[PDB]
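Support request from a user on the community tier.

User writes: "When I paste my structure tokens into the form, the page sometimes reloads and wipes my input. The last time it worked, I copied everything first. Here is what I submitted, just in case something in the input itself triggers the reload:"
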């Protein structure tokens, strides 16, 4: 059950005026592709707040990677789901090395040393790499049952150029005539149920490959791509959500650089 939205004053959407004319904003299976200009964040914030939505953000920081946690968490505090309930889950082999970062109200962090718990603690799970920093808004516009993010190096590439696993001996195998997009393994998520289904499927596929003496060209990312090819994501995030400015610059098609690699 969803309560009604309150009176809101905003620009009327124009049916005969497309959002963006420079990019694809909806997939062939009718899943929105999230670009700046396609969403009114005020409307979306209202919808998700009325549901008291809690977002879990998971990150793994092992060995030398624990050094990236401070900037990651500090910038997430400024740009990630601000205004909503957030629960950070930091998986690390060095619990005492996790930096003491000041969090806004309604936000918490749990350190897990290296999950039915996720089902009872959050509504959505967002899985990202730690050697990154948020530079702009990353909010509820990304929430949906299952989402993948367009890899910044292949969004304008033809499918045959995609670096999918091409060996039929692997469970992640995808032939040259198949494939929608090349998703980057560094940023995916969805409802807890859908994320666990995906991780469970990939874990099993990787075990099968191991028993067969084969390892996918791009490991987890290869399996993620195979999974999203067979189970279409309900939203696809544009490269605004996973960029590397040092390597790729700043093309006009990107009005915002929201989550980027750390040089
Ligand atoms: C068009 C082309 O092939 N460009 C190269 C990229 O594919 C490389 O990025 C790497 O891509 C593979 C999958 O093919 C995988 O996703 C790697 O994680 C990814 O490298 C990461 O992401 C990049 C955007 C950079 O931020 C890099 O520092 C990360 O480690 C890149 C980097 O090897 O080279 C292009 O030539
Ligand atoms: Cl994950
Ligand atoms: Cl992850
Ligand atoms: Hg628009
Ligand atoms: Hg996760
Ligand atoms: Hg993760
Ligand atoms: Hg998979
Ligand atoms: Hg896996
Ligand atoms: Hg995966």
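"...and here is what came back when it finally went through:"
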């Amino acid at each position: 059950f969803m309560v009604s939205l309150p009176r809101m004053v905003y620009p009327q959407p124009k049916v005969l005026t497309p959002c963006r004319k420079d990019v694809l904003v909806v997939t062939p299976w009718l899943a929105p592709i999230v670009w700046e200009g396609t969403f009114n964040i005020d409307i979306l914030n209202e919808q998700f707040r009325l549901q008291n939505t809690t977002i879990g953000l998971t990150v793994f920081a092992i060995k030398k990677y624990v050094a990236f946690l401070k900037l990651f968490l500090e910038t997430a505090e400024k740009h990630f789901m601000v205004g909503h309930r957030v629960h950070y889950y930091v998986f690390t082999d060095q619990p005492a090395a996790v930096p003491r970062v000041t969090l806004g109200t309604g936000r918490q962090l749990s350190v897990l040393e290296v999950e039915r718990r996720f089902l009872s603690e959050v509504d959505y799970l967002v899985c990202v790499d730690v050697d990154m920093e948020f530079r702009d808004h990353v909010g509820v516009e990304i929430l949906t049952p299952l989402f993948g993010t367009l890899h910044p190096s292949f969004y304008g590439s033809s499918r045959e150029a995609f670096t999918y696993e091409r060996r039929p001996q692997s469970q992640a195998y995808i032939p040259k005539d198949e494939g929608d997009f090349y998703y980057m393994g560094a940023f995916f998520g969805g409802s807890v149920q859908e994320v666990q289904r995906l991780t469970r499927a990939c874990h099993q596929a990787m075990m099968v490959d191991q028993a067969n003496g084969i390892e996918a060209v791009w490991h987890d990312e290869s399996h993620l791509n195979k999974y999203l090819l067979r189970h279409k994501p309900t939203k696809v995030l544009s490269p605004e959500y996973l960029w590397d400015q040092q390597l790729l610059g700043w093309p006009a098609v990107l009005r915002k650089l929201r989550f980027t690699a750390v040089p």
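Agent notes: The reload is a front-end session timeout and is unrelated to the input. Residues 127-128 surround chloride ion (ligand 3) (CB under 6 Å). The domain at 1-263 is CATH 3.90.550.10 (Spore Coat Polysaccharide Biosynthesis Protein SpsA; Chain A). Escalated to web team.
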